[model samples]
Each structure stands twice: as C-alpha cells, then as structure tokens.
Target chain A: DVLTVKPLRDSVKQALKNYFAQLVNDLYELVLAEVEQPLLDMVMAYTRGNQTRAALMMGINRGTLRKKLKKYGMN
Target chain B: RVNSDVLTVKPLRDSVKQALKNYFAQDVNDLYELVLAEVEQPLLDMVMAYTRGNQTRAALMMGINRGTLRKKLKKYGMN
Candidate 1:
C-alpha cells in the first residue's frame, strides 16, 4: 500500500531499455538532474519559498540552498 | 530514520512530497540518498552503453575510479 523503489526503478528501466539502444554521455549527471529538479521544486514549494526554512528542511546551508536555487534560476 | 518502504515512487516531485510527508520526521539527506540510490542502476547502465562497455573510459568520464565503477557495475549485476 505504501511506496517502494519499484516505481522509480520501473521508470528508469523502461526508459533506459529504450536507451539501451542509445546517449550523448554523462547520463548519470543527466538523470540526477531530472531527479534533483523535482526534488528542489518540491522542497521549495513545501517551504512556501522561504529560503531559510527551505534550507533548514533540506539540511543544507542557506548559502548552498541559494546556490542550488540559483542554478534553477530561482535566486 | 530509514524506513525502507517509504522510498522511491513517482512523477517524482509528487511522491517526493508524499514521502516527505509520510516520513516527515526524517532529514532531507536521508530521502535524498534513497532516491539517488534508486536511480544509480539505470544511470550506470546508460553510461556503460555510452562508453560501449569500456570500464576505464566510463570510469574516467564519470569521475569515478575504475575499481569503484567495477564495484557498482557488479553491485547492479551489470556485468
């Protein structure tokens, strides 16, 4: 009834199975970017755009949080 | 703070929030690690293909050691 690693695993397996046939390289970084974007978005949303709280919640420093958000054009 | 089942699922952000809520007691790093781990197999596999299964090249390109790459490839049963 709860979540497991299966959904993400399935998502990767199905998608990569398609790519088991293809990539331009740096697939790991590319995939992590996809994972990181949604994660950053959600955490920001969860904190209602409060940088301090978001940084605390993320367990990353405010400087790091600002750095990451900047990467996504947030700050 | 690591409950195994309350792990990877979804449109990602969606479950990320849901899981975040479900295990709201945990730290951000914990959930982040589990999610990252879940993607590693496919990530590694794709890199392997891109390198045409060349361990040395894949290792260099990924900024990881060849031995570490071998370990992960073996861990994921990619070999």
Candidate 2:
C-alpha cells in the first residue's frame, strides 16, 4: 500500500530514466543491476532512510527521493 | 609532479582521445549523455590541467572544435 503525489513522482522517475538513457547504452540493465543495490544500501545507510539526506547526497530534491524509495519498495 | 613542460601533452591528449574512442567506437545508442556525464569531469580536469586550463588547446587535442568544448564547459559548469 502506497500513497504518492502522482504528478511529481511520475516526473522525477521520468527524469532519472531520461538521464540514464542519454548516458548509457546496452549496459543499462547490466549497470543498474550493479549500481542500484549498492546505491540503495549506501543511501539508506547515509540517510538511515531519513529521506532528506539521501536526497541531498543523491542531488535530488526530498520529494524526488521519496518517489524513488517508494518505487524500490525501500520504505 | 610531472613537470608541466616536460610531460608530453600526449599523456593528457591520449587519455581524452581514448575516452572519446571508447564511447564512440562502439554502437552505443542511448546512453550518450550518461556516458558523457560519467566520463567528463575527470577527462576535463586532466586535459585542462595539462593544458593549464586552455580550452582551445584541449579541444584541439581532443579533436573537437572550440565551440564543442565551450558547450561541454557550459554543460558541466566548468566556468
């Protein structure tokens, strides 16, 4: 069960996807596999799942990180 | 420290050349910007430092025009 502010969530996810789309090629899934798990673990450790710090470190806004955490089932 | 004058520009030149080749040699389709984002800062830092931050020489060494380097500088906030 999750409640997200749909407009913002959709926009940010799109931005992340676009960012990666421009920078990576066939290695998208492969690299994401390597990166996501560690990224999740590190951000969680750094933020303690607090949302704010993770967003700062990730260079995203607070609401944006919430959207990602929700997408990854992190919360 | 590699004495600035003694160090062959090739070291810096080759590094950027190699990086561009690595990105462009293959048929990489989607990840252009991301690959650039990933590779850029270090490439710029090394090349610019080697050229003593001379964008023109760096661009020439990289086989790109000065305008292209300016665009990247804007993109990565080099100035």
Candidate 3:
C-alpha cells in the first residue's frame, strides 16, 4: 500500500525551491489532494470498482471505503 | 519499524524535515498539519473512487459517519 517515499518528498522539495519566492498556503492539503486522487484511482482500478474487494484490498472497512469513493465522486 | 505502511509514511516526514532543513535551516511549525492534509486528501479521494460515487455505501465502506464523510469532502472540495 505504501508508495515510493523518496519521489514524493523530492518533488515537494523541488517545488519549494522552484517556487520559493511565490506565496504558498495550504501546502499540506495541496500535497494530500494531489496524491489522494491518484491513489484512489489506482486502487479502484485494481479492484475493478468492487467495493468489498477494494475495502479488503485497502485494509479498511467497506463503509469507510464507500464514503471515500463517494467523496471522490467515483461511486 | 519497517511495515510497508510505516516505510511509506516515514519518507514523507523525513522528506519534509529534510526540505525544511535545506530551505529554512532548523525551523519547525505546523508540520503535522502540513503533512496530514497532504495525506488525507488522496486517502479520501481513493476511498470515494473505490465505491463508485455511492455516498451511503461509501460511508459504510469507510467506517465513518456519512455526515462526517460529507463534511470532509466539502472541506477538501472533493464534493
């Protein structure tokens, strides 16, 4: 379930450097949002949109999985 | 200490810490808030995608209150 850690931090650091002068806010949320969407997409695709299976695959409850899918408008 | 999940998260914190050191040189503030938000958005997004746009079903799958899920979606503008 864990993705590559180095790239995430490396890219973020690179962005910080690239845009050091630009004003940034909600930096944390921005990163989460960016990653969360792709994670969901891959997981859903991996399970072929089977909620129960996806939930099990993700090690989360079915309900939690469902709500998350709803949040992303994948449901 | 080397669970797949832990390995995944440790790099996140380490990277941010490294970045801070590289850029700010020993400044710390709201690191948790910064990292958690970055993490949560994708989490919620993936869960929602797993359910195929069914809020009630999604809520059930996520093990959170439907209302709470809705609120979070709103918070993150995922709704």
Candidate 4:
C-alpha cells in the first residue's frame, strides 16, 4: 500500500508558499507564538460557526475573517 | 483578538501609516499597488476569517456604506 504522505507534503508546500507570499515573512512565527492557539478555537466556538456573529465579536469584516480562516485551513 | 487600544496594535498601525505616507509621496501608483498587495487581501481575508464568510456582518464590521461595500465585494469578487 502507498503511504499518503505525499499529499501531506504538498499541503505543507502550498501553505508555506502562500504564507511567504505575504510580506510578513519570517515574522508570522513570532505573532503566532504571541497569540494563544486556543484563542482561535474560542473565537470560532463563540461565533458558533456564524461568520457574521464571529466577525462582529472579533471586530473585523467578514471577508477578512473568512480569509484568515481559509488561510489557517480552519473548518 | 484583543482590544484595539492595545499598545502593540497602535504602534503597528502607526508604523504602517507612516511608511505608506512616505511611500506614496514618492510614487502614488507604486503605493497604490503596494497597498493592494499588502493591505487589501489581508484586510479582506482577515475580516472574512473573523465573520466566517458572512457578507452582511462583514459589511457592517467594515463600517462603510453598505452599497459601497457591495460594490467592493463585486470588485474584489468577494461574493
């Protein structure tokens, strides 16, 4: 049986490519470290999968919030 | 996310404003493109991420004229 690791590697490569495409290069690590990972979950949980509610609570536009969710590959 | 009053965000926003101000002074078109590349996608994406793709909420949170927001949505292909 073939291992499915290749797809996982491709996914990683795509994530890195997009992340580096942003000007925040080499700095996102610091930002991510500063913020708690669980906080992300909290934000989503609080909104209850409602984009509108989440954006309001987070104080950002829906589009921006959606972009970030997609970027993070959040459900 | 924390409150906007936080010291860290203030400095970051101020720094970006200053840099863009100076940058635009040198080349308006260049600055325009730079803003698009640096700001637009992130702003749009961040808002979407926050709202989870709720267009109505995104429009309100953005705090602009709703019609204007719709126009932008079409322009940006946000829908």
Candidate 5:
C-alpha cells in the first residue's frame, strides 16, 4: 500500500530531521494511538453507528469494538 | 464494502506529519516498529471484522497462519 506507506514514512522522516539528537521512546504506541482514532471513527461512521457492523468490518469482536468506541467516544 | 477511494491516505499522512511538526522534539523512538504495529492493528482488526471475528476465516483471507494471527492479536491486546 504505497498510497498508505509513502506519506507515513515521509512524515516520520520529516520528524527525524526536525528533532535531531532527541531521545525518543514508546513511539510505537504513540503512532498507533494516532492512527487508530481515525480508523475507528471512519469505520463507525461508515456503519452508521451500528456496532455489530463496525466490529465486523474491523475484524474485531463486538466487545472489542464497544471498548474501542467507548475509548474514542465514537459511540 | 467501503469504496477504497473514499479514504485517501494523503490526509492521514499529512495529519501525522502535522502532529510531528506540532510536537517537535518529543520522545519518539522505534519508528519502524511503531508504525508497523499501528498499521497492523487496524488491518487485522478490520480483516477480522470482515470475517465476523472468525479467526480461521480471517486468517485465510489474510493468507497467514491462524496461530500467527492469534499471536498478533495478543500482541496488540486485541484478544
């Protein structure tokens, strides 16, 4: 998914350039959280507030979807 | 299924870049690992959702072993 990967890597490269010599940590979780929100929101909107459908589309369980929806306040 | 064209990756990428620019000099490490995990979570989540949370079916669709998929779910705290 070059459409997906190109921009992401480019942005991160920009970050590295802007913030040189800085100690970084837990970037994995940080970036994941950043990306997860929109994905969740988009899927929820696509499903028209239908949790089951959203969960199905996300490949996650209904319980997990509910948790995530609550986490992101998308419900 | 949603139209692939509906969600363009440019916006997402730009926003991420914007965030990085906004929070310049923040403690950010493990770029490769983090991005992979970040993308993987939603990829697997949606794939599983598409399969109605059926591990076997999802694994088949994803072309990965079910055991490997389960490990990934566990790693992401998705299990």
Candidate 6:
C-alpha cells in the first residue's frame, strides 16, 4: 500500500466542492493549513519521530521541519 | 455523505491524519501539490463565485494577480 495523494485529494474535494454559500474568507490560509497539518503528521509517522529523515523526504531543512513541529506541538 | 455546511469539517490535519492511515503504507513524494489542487479547486470555485466571478477582485483580495489566478483557474478547468 503506497502512500499516494489520490485519496487525500478525494476527501478534500468532497469537503470543499459543495458550495457553502458564505464566509469570512482567507482561502490560502485554509488551503495551506488544511494540507500542511496532514503532511506533517503523516511524514512524521512515516519516519516515526525521526525528524532528520522525514525532513529529507520533504525536501525541507530539518531545522525548518523542527520549527514547524514546535509550532504544531508535534515535538 | 455530503456535509452541506462549512462547519462540518474536522481540523484538516486531524482529518488528513485519518486519511493517511487509510492510504499510507513512498519515500513520501510530492504530496503537497496534489493535496493543494484537490483542496484548492473547490475552494476556488466557492470563493470565485463569492467575488461575483470577477478574477480581478478575487486575485487582489487574495493578494495575487489575474495572471496567477487565471493560471490556477485554468488548472482546475474553472473557466
């Protein structure tokens, strides 16, 4: 079972495609946070608490990932 | 199951964490782009409509421009 974005896409589309009809705004924030949270959680899970290897897979700096971990309370 | 409301969502991280449990089992490839489009498309639809389908306004408010907006809209076949 490979981890692909296909299923993730499906669920997000499912939640969002249905015209909600009103709001405060901030779409980018919504989009980024929505995606970021899972990517972090899953990558960490994939690498199992080893931020160094996980950061490499994500092509981001380990310290940057560490910063995010602290922000998200993952560390 | 259609939620029929914006409030029906779980925290995206929490929800997607559930999703990863479902499908994960990659060197963890480029998943960001994939998730963004999936989530961005529909959000764009709803948001663009809110802007009265005016790309100029939507782009500005989003702090972007018609060029990027058009590119993204085109990506989703949003017209």
Top candidate (DockQ): 6
Model 4 local distance difference test score = 0.44
lDDT of 6 by residue, B1-79 (tens): 1212252345445556766666554155555455556567766775686689888878765566679889988888887
- Candidates in order, TM-scores: namely 0.60, 0.33, 0.41, 0.34, 0.42, 0.64
Model 4: per-residue lDDT, tens digit, A1-75?
111223222322333334334422222233232222223344566457887776665566789767766655574
Query: Please, what is the whole-model Cα lDDT of each candidate in the order they appear?
Result: 0.61, 0.45, 0.51, 0.44, 0.54, 0.63
Clashing residue pairs, candidate 2?
A: A22-B31, A22-B32, A22-B33, A22-B34, A23-B31, A23-B33, A23-B34, A23-B35, A24-B31
Ranking by TM-score: 6, 1, 5, 3, 4, 2
Off by over 4 Å in 5: A2-24, B1-79
For residues B1-79, could you state the per-residue lDDT of candidate 5 as single tens digits? Answer: 1111112234344454444333333322233344455466656665566568899876775566789889999999999
Residue B76 CA error for candidate 4 (Å)? 2.7
Per-residue lDDT, model 5, residue B48, is 66
DockQ of 6: 0.36
TM-score of chain B of 6: 0.69
Give the CA lDDT, 0 to 100, for residue A63 in model 2: 84
lDDT of 6 by residue, A1-75 (tens): 233335555555555544243333445565655567667878788888788887777777888888867765667
Off by over 4 Å in 3: A16-21, B1-79
Alpha-carbon shift of residue B51 in model 6 (angstroms): 3.0
- The per-candidate TM-score of the B chain, in the order shown, comes to 0.57, 0.57, 0.63, 0.54, 0.66, 0.69
Cα RMSD to native, each candidate? 7.6, 18.8, 15.7, 18.4, 15.4, 5.3
What's the lDDT for residue B50 in model 1?
A: 72
Q: How would you class the docking of model 3? A: incorrect
By DockQ rank, best first, the candidates go: 6, 1, 3, 5, 4, 2
Per-residue lDDT of model 1, residues B1-79, tens digit only: 1112112223433444454455443335444456566668766876677778888888776677789888888877887
Q: What TM-score would candidate 5 get against the native?
A: 0.42
Ranking by lDDT: 6, 1, 5, 3, 2, 4
